[PDB]
Amino acid sequence: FQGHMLFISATNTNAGKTTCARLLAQYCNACGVKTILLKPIETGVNDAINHSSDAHLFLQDNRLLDRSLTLKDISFYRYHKVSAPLIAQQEEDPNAPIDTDNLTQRLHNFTKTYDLVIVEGAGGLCVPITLEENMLDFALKLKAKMLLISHDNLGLINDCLLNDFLLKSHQLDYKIAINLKGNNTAFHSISLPYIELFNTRSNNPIVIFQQSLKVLMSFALKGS
Template sequence: MSKRIFVTATNTNIGKTHTSKLLIQAFSALGFSVGVYKPIETGVKDFPSDGSELFNAACIHNSALLSLTLQNIVPLQFTLPAAPFVANRGRKIDFTLFDSALAKIEALCDIVIIEGAGGLMVPIDSETMMIDLARYFNATTLLVTHCNLGCINDTLLSINVLEESKLPFVVGFNCRAEDTSFETTSLPYLNYRFPSIYRIDQDIDTIAKALLDTISS
């Protein structure tokens, strides 16, 4: 089994795919062959856009993945841009459906980056949430959070859920150009609360190594 990293976020449109693409580069630079997996994607029209971005980015560094198809990378696709529970009309999703596609990907890589949909508490069906995918895959989680006002609350809520679930994780802040207040409104408390603050664009190599350390521990 390859090393598994589950990329999630504090909400939708926080930067999971952007972060996953940077992780592909970082792990590849460390000498690993990297695979990608997006088990569920909603809001799919002609093709799964997030999954396609991940697949194309990974194939640049790991040409062995070219033997796969986009359907392997994104096995469950729904048209409605909503939580899987809603997009799939509340029907049960059997997690074992994800195993065969993951096995094909893992045969071609040392590390697989598994990107979730939305945040940790997005409902997949009546019994499971997105966080249950991280547990099912036995993966270390990278929590991607934002840097605008409100990030303290959103980040701590997600951290509490991960800690209560006893899942290993690393946190990365995806600061964008418009997040001009982060240094004055949020960072002072975050520096007080945590020993290290990782920023996605500045510290991706450090984040990659921290994830490896978490997997190894």
């Protein structure tokens, strides 16, 4: 096949998509699985004055494989407003709705030259891109596998299960992974006992990202 494609979404913004995407791509590249990081849509950015956006971090890592990459090669719709993409676009660029057909072509083109194309979304699954399409719809159009990153705090059970319900209702292969931060041992006492019960009762278990680099690489590469 051409390169595999893995979409990274989350329970919400700030859950750890960027952090976990970078860790996974680093691991894959270290294993000889040539992997690129893409951030097709990004809000809340000012590129004239700040070089620490998700796309900038991705670019730093990606340039270890291709010096010629620039920001515009890996991020295509970028807005100042710290909001959902649809709202940012309507306010800042009302004459250019986000074109997911175009994005699909650009993203799939990278499957020629990489073993794995990692595509970070923005916010969570239901975040609107166009009037018709949210982030999940975009992932579906891409025919990507899904990695959904959860936060590690009280409330993650609800947030994971809401996403599980939405994901299992659609036709895609997915995995939910908890981004367990350094210094959090409340997790193991408070939330983990339910994750373990859930996993004994589910065909698709919720995993801990930091325990799962090998498993998630395998997931990302399996099948067609």
